[model samples]
Target: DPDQLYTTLKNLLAQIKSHPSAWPFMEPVKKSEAPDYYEVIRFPIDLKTMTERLRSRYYVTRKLFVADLQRVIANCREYNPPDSEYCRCASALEKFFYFKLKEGGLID
Candidate 1:
């Protein structure tokens, strides 16, 4: 039973991550542009402020679901037998956010 649950959760997380296209709002950039395009929009919005706004919007609309995800991770880590399914799903979510933060090159 536990193994079955784990497998299902693992598959669910993988499907969600792999098919990010399923969620239109998760698409970071609306349109692809040349590298120099960043030069125009870059200076206009403060990076820190922009990131905060993005994060707020993400959680507000449940588009990103990072906070809820973190809570799930915490619960998984606290599981009595440490459910592998929950752990894997939580880890994937954590990695996803870590990748986002790293890609953005944000310290915090």
Candidate 2:
């Protein structure tokens, strides 16, 4: 379902977009990603470039600041894998990058 996929992405964004971590974003995603996720949808979301900005060590806030993250998301949707693992992994990787940088010092 397209709607389901979008919701998954959007919900993940809204959930992981701007969260405060207790010890930086270093631990396993499940270990140090969110304050908590009743459930996190790991679908193809537009967070690929979001990390570029976050990883810049510019701020300590979470947001859609992954630079061209929106673009990456746009690319995924434009490419339209139609429910494939590749798209999902792409989305997940970008999201993970954001957190990894957060642990380094950046946080968005």
Candidate 3:
């Protein structure tokens, strides 16, 4: 409903504020695993590392949930390869949460 859009996006803002690495909540990361929010704003991005991270999920999973995240990311992409890593990962992670929550009967 459009009426809930405001509340929904506000919730998303808090989640997005948590990070680029752990949005929608996949991987073996906590919100704190990322840098503090204030510090993130001033940091310079290392494109090499960023690309490498996109190529692989080793860092994000910290080697545990590393299985098939790339392949799953592609399936999640559906329209593009790598599919803009930010939205790419976010979409995939959200699915992970959705699946787990569904399994637990938390959401339907």
Q: How many residue pairs clash (N, CA or C atoms closer than 3 angstroms) in each of the candidate models, in the order given?
A: 0, 5, 0
Error of 2 at 55 (Å): 16
Q: What are the models' TM-scores?
A: 0.32, 0.31, 0.27
Tens-digit lDDT string for candidate 2 (12-51): 4454544432122222233253333214334333333333
Per residue, candidate 3 scores C-alpha lDDT tens digits across 59-89 of: 3432222223333333334433454765566
Name the lDDT of candidate 1.
0.40
Tens digits of per-residue lDDT, candidate 1, 8-105, equal: 33443444445333232122322362243344333222223324444444333332333443443454455413656535655665576566544433
User: CA lDDT of each candidate?
Assistant: 0.40, 0.42, 0.39
Q: Which stretches of candidate 2 lie over 4 Å from their true place?
A: 1-65
Worst 10 residues of 3 by lDDT: 61-70
* Decreasing TM-score order of the candidates: 1, 2, 3
TM-score computed on alpha carbons, candidate 3: 0.27
Model 2 clash number: 5
